């Protein structure tokens, strides 16, 4: 999906994320709901307060999907097929929202891995998140 250099940077950076993917996914969602309130409309059935167990549980699923993706950089379409259906076909998520969550995920990583979040790694992660976003909204294109 990305360049080989990018592939390397992403795999390396995610190794540093390690077992915090879940925690990070949850924090990224929290920063998105607070920062971009329009996004809350997709989660009526969710308790959005800080520490909500649903957000926590949901953060884990997001972190797992990103982990999967990192493992299948050469076949995102196939690996994320099921999620593309849900997001685009079932939920009709506005494509702009992917950009907002991407931003919130980078913010989170910056908070937690300041020494690992270098300009080169930031650039590779942005490319990765955009690639993931394209697959999730491809039922549009």
């Amino acid at each position: 999906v990305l360049s080989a250099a990018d592939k390397t940077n992403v795999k390396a950076a995610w190794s540093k994320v390690g077992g915090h993917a879940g925690e990070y996914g949850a924090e990224a969602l929290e920063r998105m709901f607070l920062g971009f309130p329009t996004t809350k409309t997709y989660f009526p059935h969710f308790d959005l307060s800080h520490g909500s167990a649903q957000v926590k549980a949901h953060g884990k699923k997001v972190g797992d999907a990103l982990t999967l993706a990192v493992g299948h950089l050469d076949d995102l379409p196939g690996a994320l097929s099921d999620l593309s259906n849900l997001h685009a076909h079932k939920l009709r998520v506005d494509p702009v929202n992917f950009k907002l969550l991407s931003h919130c995920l980078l913010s989170t990583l910056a908070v937690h891995l300041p020494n690992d979040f270098t300009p080169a790694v930031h650039a590779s992660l942005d490319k990765f998140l955009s690639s993931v976003s394209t697959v999730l909204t491809s039922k549009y294109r």
Binding site: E27, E30, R31, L34, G35, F36, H50, H103, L106, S107, T108, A110, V111, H112, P114, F117, T118, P119, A120, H122, A123, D126
Partner: protein, 146 residues
């Protein structure tokens, strides 16, 4: 910008801790590295071809300080963003012809740098206020396009 008093105080308090030079140099460098088409506007700065070259370029650092300074003026003037940035708006719009989407990109990059620098102190709540500020700045700069 529509910020409460609590929000405004928290925003100002963080700014007291912002090193305009360090933050500014890093924000502009990251923009140039992450969104490469932005390099087109800074040809006069020399070598911007690789991360190393960009991050260590003295013109980038100097210019980033300038950017952050004007940002700081906005932070201090939340009630008249349009008035504060009118001259910069004319510059970016009339003279440079920078697409306004890029204003939004820089604001978000700034937010990521603040997170990197403040860690756990850059709470989801504080980040939310800063998103309002960056949005306000981007809008005031897009002014002369409207």
């Amino acid at each position: 910008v529509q910020l409460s008093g609590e929000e405004k105080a928290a925003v100002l308090a963080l700014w007291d801790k912002v090193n305009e030079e360090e933050v500014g140099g890093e924000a502009l460098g990251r923009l140039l590295v992450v969104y490469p088409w932005t390099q087109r506007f800074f040809d006069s700065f020399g070598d911007l071809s690789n991360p190393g070259a960009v991050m260590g370029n003295p013109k980038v650092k100097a210019h980033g300080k300038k950017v952050l300074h004007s940002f700081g003026e906005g932070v201090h003037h939340l009630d008249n963003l349009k008035g504060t940035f009118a001259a910069l708006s004319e510059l970016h719009c009339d003279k440079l012809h920078v697409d306004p989407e890029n204003f939004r990109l820089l604001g978000n990059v700034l937010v990521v740098v603040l997170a990197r620098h403040f860690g756990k102190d850059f709470t989801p709540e504080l980040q939310a206020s800063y998103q309002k500020v960056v949005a306000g700045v981007a809008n005031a700069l897009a002014h002369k396009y409207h």
